[PDB]
Amino acid sequence: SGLVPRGSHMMLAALKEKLAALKEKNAALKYKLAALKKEKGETPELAALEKELAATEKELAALEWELAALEADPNPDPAKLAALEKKLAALEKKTAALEYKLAAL
């Protein structure tokens, strides 16, 4: 099997920390968003951003279950780990853009 088990073990740990950092970063945008909702009202723009945040929070919770099941697998599928890394990478980019967009409002 070579370095396949070691690569899966290292990628599992990297994705676990990546996901936990995304959960904290996305939850912190709730407080800034609610502050903007209080200051400006629940505008159509702020309402749409709240749905994005809620949807991102919902997906991170589901991907966390997927990561939990892969961590319990004695031989996790490297293809599932690679696909999970790609999803988290895209969620990182959406969260970074939402953070800059909330700071600009």
Numbering used by the authors: -9 to 95
The study reports:
Here we describe the combination of rational and computational design to deliver three-helix bundle (3HB) peptide assemblies and single-chain proteins with control over topology and thermal stability. First, we garner sequence-to-structure relationships from antiparallel 3HBs in the Protein Data Bank. This gives core-packing rules, including layers of hydrogen-bonded polar residues, which are combined with surface-charge patterning to design complementary sequences for acidic (A), basic (B), and neutral (N) helices. Next, AlphaFold2 models for both designs are used to seed computational designs of single-chain proteins where the helices are connected by loop building. Synthetic genes for these express in E. coli to yield soluble, monomeric, and thermally stable proteins.
Given the underrepresentation of clockwise topologies in nature and the associated design challenge, we initially prioritised this configuration. To do this here, we used MASTER to search the RCSB PDB for loops to connect helices in the AF2 models for the clockwise, apCCTri-BĀN, and anticlockwise, apCCTri-BĀN′, topologies. Next, ProteinMPNN was used to optimise the loop regions of the single-chain models while keeping the helical seeds completely intact. Based on pLDDT and RMSD, two BĀN and one BĀN′ single-chain designs were chosen to test experimentally. CD spectroscopy of all proteins showed that they were highly α helical and hyper-thermally stable, and AUC experiments confirmed they were monomeric in solution. We solved X-ray crystal structures at 2.10 Å, 2.15 Å and 2.20 Å resolution for the two BĀN- and one BĀN′-based designs, respectively. This was done by molecular replacement using the AF2 models of the peptide assemblies as the search models. All confirmed the three-helix bundles with up-down-up topologies for the B-Ā-N/N′ helices. All had consolidated hydrophobic cores with knobs-into-holes packing between the core Leu residues confirmed by Socket2. In addition, water-mediated hydrogen-bonded layer of Thr (A) – Asn (B) – Thr (N/N′) was present in a clockwise design.
